[PDB]
RNA sequence: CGCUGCUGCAGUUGAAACGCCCGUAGUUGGCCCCCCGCCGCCACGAGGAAACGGGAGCGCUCCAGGCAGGCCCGUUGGCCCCGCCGCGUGGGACCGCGCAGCGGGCGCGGCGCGCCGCCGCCGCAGCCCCGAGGAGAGCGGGCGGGGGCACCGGUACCGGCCGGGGACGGGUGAAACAGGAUGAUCCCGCCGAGACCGCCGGCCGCGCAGGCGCCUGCCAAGACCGCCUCUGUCAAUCAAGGGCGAAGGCCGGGGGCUAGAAGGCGAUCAGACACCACCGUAUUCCCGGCCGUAAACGGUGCCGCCCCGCGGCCGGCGCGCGCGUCCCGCCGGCCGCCCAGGGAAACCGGGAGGCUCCGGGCUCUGGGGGGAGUAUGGCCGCAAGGCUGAAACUUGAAGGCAUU
RNA sequence: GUCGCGGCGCGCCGAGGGCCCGACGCCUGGCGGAGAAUCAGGGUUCGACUCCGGAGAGCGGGCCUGCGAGACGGCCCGCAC
């Protein structure tokens, strides 16, 4: 029994963002715990531009075509 | 599809349905506008501004926090780029091709790509002039191109 | 092919018809005006003429016969027509340079049957129809 | 790109009915599609249509009752004399008794039968039987 | 402008004389002889012919041996390379 | 290749007519 | 009548391929169309191999294998029976026979 | 005769998608604001000769006729059709477009007004549809025989110089012609030119096609994917117009190894002056122009929309999982097979499907076969030619795919 | 100047007016419509002649009379015959 009205959330995710019934962000705002700070730094999962940790001079984000890798101790998803 | 190419591709960005300001937000609309204004004061393409706002800060979409576009924000304060960022970035691309062509006399392929980029500057100019964003006198010409980009 | 079908594409549809209507061989023969100028019987059912010579034509194979015909010079256009005198032995009724009325074979300028090169055929000789002479309804 | 949206959707509805699928997702949505679907729902050739509104053009999810033979668009949207609407039905629709040519009139989008009832001519959006 | 439509650009002087083949050949040689070439020292396009084989850069004030109608001849360009490759190889 | 050789033979006739006209001119 | 979907050649997403030469006919064939068989056969015959191995005065000698890629043109290959005409249905069938 | 196709034709193979690409006119343009204004559009009028077509009424003895006739509408001869792209009226769905901040009083301000100005005047929520599974620009990471210029490796064919050792060597289907005691072939050592980038090399990839492979430094690009980056209809296709375009050729240099259009010579034949040897000019390679064609073919234009399974390959990106270039998706392309569906069938099925139940948009092309891509005029080229393009006349088949 | 408007003629003064929505040029065994023929629908084809409007009376011109004709069963002239 499938009604397009209510798509399964775990199936909708498998579909391309544009292909989904409601076009939606395929990416989430993340929050990382800084190595040199105890305060979360809201970041984008697919961010590319170097993001510097507060105070720490170097960017904590190593970019890639998809989800940016992180170097210093980080947090997973929004916090 | 793809204008001067034959490729068909969809790598667009899908906007959020809720036009919601960030719950995780430390930025007032006045704070957001000032940062866009100050990035422009330093001097940056609008596409770069939205990348700084999204990466260094958390403003996913400027429209969500303040109900305006990024160029609309820069026209209001008055730091509007006189030649639009899309035309300016294609004019720059053309000038680069011509300089390469100067060393490579027989690069027939580069000459073909140049006609494409020229046409996409010409088509975009005719639109911007009709919208009146660009002055009626504005014309893309090879000699003036170098100086218009500077 | 989309056959240009838009509410404002009515000159294109008209233009295409007038240009491509000339492709048809029959419409071309009918409305070019080339047949009218070149026709020995130009827009005429038949014409008066003198018999240039009485010469039979050998029929196209498979059929094998000498179909007696007469070469005919037309009074109206001074063009020479090859006209097949019909029925049996009707060539005898005609004498060289006799008055002859000739009508097309019936294929509208095309040769009819085995006779090679016969766009026309004889209908009347010196005022008397060849059938009327043939059936002896009216003698020479 | 898409110049006719109704035609692209109606073709999808017919294509789903061929493979016996009740629910179809129409990617482009329009007020003309909306009205065309409403008329088919009234004549019961289609069932409830639910529009998932999006911040863009919109998509429609239509439940089918398996009772539509064929739908179509007339391009361009011709002008029909009210008197000659019968000729359009005689050729496009099978049988004077069954089938609906869908028109647009200054009064509103209307059925060929309703158009005859008040004798008003118009433009043909399409046709469904 | 384009006062001569065809390739009678430098050969307009000859007028209707000498035949097309001679004038076509002269176009190439004459245009090459009165052309400005780039001096391998001044690096300025100021080399002009003084006589057959002798070319001088007006700014560099250096005279160099060359082809009768071009500062550098194709056989010579190849020879310099062959002599360089053989020289580097010997050492 | 008869059609290739037939095109070559029309070319020759075309040259002969084109040249003959010049002698007539 | 299009005899083959391949059109006799394996050029896909291409417009031009390297020319090769029939090894017997010495004719220019598109690389995709050519037969392109491969042989790893050893240099000396199997019988001579035992006689040569006993003769060899070096220990651990093994007969050298000879590797070549035989490319033949369609006419050259079918005539020397490298490939064979196949039935309409068996033409569709692939795989080494 | 739907064989002219608006309805309503075809272009894989019967005739027919321009070789490829940009492009101006032209034509076509996602959605979206209800509410008026002009559009177009549709209905309804008004007015503008009949005959004519239809049609009421009628026995010319019947009729084709005629408006006559009959003890009569005020006896009849009504009524419709002058497409009237004009006119007036309504509606506003659809279809095109609309640049002004609006107001309140001064002003009932010269028979009712309105215009224009002057007043922040305190009335207005005074002012941005949105973010197209449209397109452009950005960023990030990979991507590939993509392009130019540059540099340089490697054998091999060929020549050249020794040294050795020795009679044939070549060539073939068998031969023969040339090579060799001035020592050939053969071997090794070198030496120099020019071409070419082998095996890896493919249901690989890339490029707009034509096409693309040594070291591939360095110079600009291009798709694709990713993204809560940016712009906001900037689009699709296209006469006219431009660019590019294999090979062969051509004009003029550079080169010149190898093959080799010409030519010459063996053979082979009845004759080959052909196929097969052998020799070899133009050519083949580079630069600067031409030329503008190819079975330039997927013999299938381009932009869309949907459409079922079964796998492969390549380029990104995610979902996970012990955990591996594994699995599973999303994919952008390259492909095989195929149920429906389609077709004259072969076959397509990532379309050649959604089509007699015939209409998304655009541009091109064909109309039985010859004559004929000829004639003539033009344009272009140095030429060769290319592009445009008949007619007289002739003629019953030509052709497709299948069966025996 | 005309019955009268108008480049309709003249002087003067400018630089226009047209066109791939096909101008201009050329051709037409081109009168036009009311209508006709053939016919499911859409089309196609033909408009000498009846009715209407044009245009001409061998060919060009030029004219008086008249309320009106650039008249030809008026006149005058050039050209044919």
Residue G42 sits at φ, ψ, to 5 deg, of -70, 165
* B99-112 CB burial, b ≥16 within 10 A, e <16: eeeeeeeeeeeeee
CA C61 to chain centroid:
22
Same domain, D85 and D128: yes
Choosing from D20, D48, D68, the residue where a domain stops is D68
**Interface mutation vs chain D, best among B1, B13, B17, most D CBs within 10 Å:** B17
Same domain, D63 and D3: yes
Count of CB pairs separated by less than 8 Å, A with D: 17
- Report how far apart, in Å, the C-alpha atoms of E53 and of each of B37, C17, E66, E77 are: 67, 71, 5, 15
- State the nearest Cα–Cα gap between C15 and chain D, in angstroms: 19
Considering all nucleic acid strands, name the nucleotide whose C1' atom is nearest to the C-alpha of residue B18. Answer: H228
- Nucleotide H357's nearest residue (CA vs C1') is D70
Question: What residues of chain C lie within 8 A of the CB of D75, using their CB?
Answer: 5
Residues whose CB is below 7 A of strand I: C 11, 31, 33, 36-37, 42-43; D 87, 91
- D78-CA/H56-C1' distance, Å: 38
Same domain, D73 and D51: no
Same domain, D56 and D94: no
Same domain, D88 and D104: yes
Could you please report the per-residue DSSP string of chain A? Answer: ---TTS--HHHHTTS-TTTSSS---SS-EEEEE-SS-SSEEEEETT--S--BPSS-SSBSEE--SSSPEE-SS---S--
D64 in Cβ contact with D24 (< 8 Å): yes
Choosing from D68, D92, D120, the residue where a domain stops is D68
Same domain, D42 and D58: yes
A23 touches chain D (CB under 8 A): yes
**How many folded domains does chain D comprise?**
2
Report the C-alpha gap between C103 and C126 in whole angstroms: 15
Same domain, D122 and D61: no
C70 in Cβ contact with C77 (< 8 Å): no
- G37-CA/I64-C1' distance, Å: 113
Those residues with Cβ within 8 angstroms of residue D36's Cβ, 6 or more apart along the chain or in another chain:
D6, D10, D71, D102, D109, D125, D126, D128
Strands C120-125, C80-84: pairing kind: parallel
Q: CB-based burial of residue G1 (10 Å sphere; 0-12 exposed, 13-18 middle, 19+ buried)?
A: exposed
Same domain, D64 and D114: no
Could you please report the per-residue DSSP string of chain B? Answer: --TTS--------PPPSS-PPPSS----HHHHHHHHHHHHHH---HHHHHHHHHHTS--S-HHHHSSS-HHHHHHHHS---SS-HHHHHHHHHHHHHHHHHHH-TT-HHHHHHHHHHHHHHHHHHHHHHHHTSS-TT----HHHHHHHH-
Same domain, D47 and D80: no
Q: Three-state SS for C46?
A: strand
* CA proximity to E65, closest of E54, E57, E73: E54
Residue spans per domain, chain G: 1-96
Same domain, D42 and D74: no
* CA proximity to B59, closest of B23, B85, B86: B23
Strands D59-64, D46-52: pairing kind: antiparallel
Choosing from D68, D92, D117, the residue where a domain stops is D68
C71 in Cβ contact with C55 (< 8 Å): yes
Range of D19's domain?
1-68
Contact B15 D55 (CB under 8 A): yes
Report the C-alpha gap between B27 and B33 in whole angstroms: 10
Query: Which residue in the set A4, A21, A23 is minimally distant from D56, CB to CB?
Result: A23
Considering all nucleic acid strands, name the nucleotide whose C1' atom is nearest to the C-alpha of residue C21. Answer: H4
DSSP conformation class of C19 = H
Those residues with Cβ within 8 angstroms of residue A5's Cβ, 6 or more apart along the chain or in another chain:
D50, D52, D61
Most distant CA atoms of chain F, gap in Å: 37
Those residues with Cβ within 8 angstroms of residue C28's Cβ, 6 or more apart along the chain or in another chain:
C22, C34
Same domain, D64 and D48: yes
Same domain, D27 and D63: yes
The answer to whether the Cα torsion of C37, C39, C45, C51 is positive or negative is: positive
D51 in Cβ contact with D34 (< 8 Å): yes
């Amino acid at each position: 029994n499938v009604d397009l009205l209510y798509p399964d959330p775990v199936e909708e995710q498998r579909k391309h963002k544009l292909k989904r019934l409601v076009q939606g962000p395929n990416s989430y705002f993340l929050e990382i715990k800084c190595a040199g700070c105890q305060d979360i730094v809201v970041v984008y999962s697919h961010a590319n531009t170097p993001v510097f940790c507060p105070g720490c001079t170097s960017q904590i984000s190593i970019p890639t075509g998809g989800k940016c890798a992180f170097t210093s101790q980080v947090e997973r998803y929004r916090q | 599809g793809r204008m001067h190419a034959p490729g068909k591709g969809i790598s667009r960005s899908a906007i959020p349905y809720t036009r919601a300001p960030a719950p995780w937000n430390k930025y007032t609309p006045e704070d957001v506008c000032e940062q866009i204004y100050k990035l422009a004061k330093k001097g940056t393409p609008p596409s770069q501004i939205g990348l700084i706002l999204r990466d260094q800060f958390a403003i996913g979409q400027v429209k969500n926090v303040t109900g305006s576009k990024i160029v609309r924000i820069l026209k209001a304060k008055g730091l509007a780029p006189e030649i639009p960022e899309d035309l300016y970035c294609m004019i720059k691309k053309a000038v680069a091709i011509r300089k390469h062509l100067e060393r490579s006399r027989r690069d027939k392929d580069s000459k073909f790509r140049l006609i494409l980029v020229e046409s996409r500057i010409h088509r975009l100019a005719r639109y911007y002039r009709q919208a009146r964003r660009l002055p009626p006198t504005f014309r893309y010409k090879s000699d003036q191109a170098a100086a218009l980009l500077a | 092919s989309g056959k240009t079908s838009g509410l404002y594409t009515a000159r294109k549809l008209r233009t295409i018809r007038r240009i491509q209507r000339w492709a048809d061989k029959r419409y071309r023969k009918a409305h070019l005006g080339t047949w009218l100028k070149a026709n020995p019987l130009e827009g005429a059912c038949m014409a008066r003429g003198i018999v240039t010579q009485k010469i039979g034509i050998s029929a196209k194979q498979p059929n094998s016969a000498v179909r007696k015909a007469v070469r005919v010079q037309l009074t109206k256009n001074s063009k020479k027509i090859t006209a097949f005198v019909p029925r049996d032995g009707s060539l005898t009724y005609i004498d060289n340079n006799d008055e002859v009325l000739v009508a097309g074979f019936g294929r509208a300028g095309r040769a009819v049957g085995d006779i090679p090169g016969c766009r026309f055929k004889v209908i009347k000789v010196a005022g008397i129809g060849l059938l009327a002479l043939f059936l002896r309804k009216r003698e020479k | 790109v898409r110049i006719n949206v109704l035609r692209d959707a109606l073709k999808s509805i017919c294509n789903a009915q061929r493979i016996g699928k009740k629910q179809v997702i129409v990617r482009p949505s329009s007020k003309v599609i909306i009205e065309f679907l409403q008329l088919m729902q009234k004549n019961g050739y289609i069932s409830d249509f639910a529009v998932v509104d999006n911040h863009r053009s919109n998509r429609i999810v239509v439940n089918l009752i398996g009772r539509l033979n064929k739908a179509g668009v007339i391009s361009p949207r011709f002008d029909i004399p009210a008197n000659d609407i019968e000729k359009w039905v005689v050729n496009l629709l099978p049988s004077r008794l069954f089938g609906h040519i869908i028109l647009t009139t200054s009064q509103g989008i209307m059925d060929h039968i309703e158009a005859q009832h008040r004798q008003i001519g118009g433009k043909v959006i399409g046709y469904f039987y | 402008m384009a006062k001569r439509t065809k390739k009678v650009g430098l050969t307009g002087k000859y007028g209707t004389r000498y035949g097309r083949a001679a004038r076509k050949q002269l176009l190439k040689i004459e245009t090459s002889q009165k052309a400005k070439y780039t001096c391998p020292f001044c690096a300025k396009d100021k080399v002009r012919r003084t006589a057959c084989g002798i070319w001088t850069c007006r700014s560099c004030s250096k005279t160099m041996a060359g082809g009768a109608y071009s500062l550098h001849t194709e056989p010579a360009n190849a020879a310099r390379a062959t002599i360089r490759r053989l020289r580097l190889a010997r050492e | 290749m008869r059609a290739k050789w037939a095109k070559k033979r029309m070319r020759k006739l075309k040259r002969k007519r084109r040249h003959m006209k010049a002698r007539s001119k | 009548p299009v005899k083959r979907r391949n059109n006799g050649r394996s050029k896909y997403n291409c417009g031009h391929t390297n020319i090769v030469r029939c090894q017997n006919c010495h004719r220019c064939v598109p690389k995709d169309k050519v037969i392109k068989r491969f042989t790893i056969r050893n240099i000396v015959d199997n019988t001579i191999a035992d006689d040569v191995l006993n003769a060899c005065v070096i220990q651990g000698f093994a007969i050298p294998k000879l590797y070549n890629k035989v490319q033949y043109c369609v006419s050259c290959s079918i005539h020397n029976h490298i490939v064979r005409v196949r039935s309409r249905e068996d033409r569709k069938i692939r795989t080494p026979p």
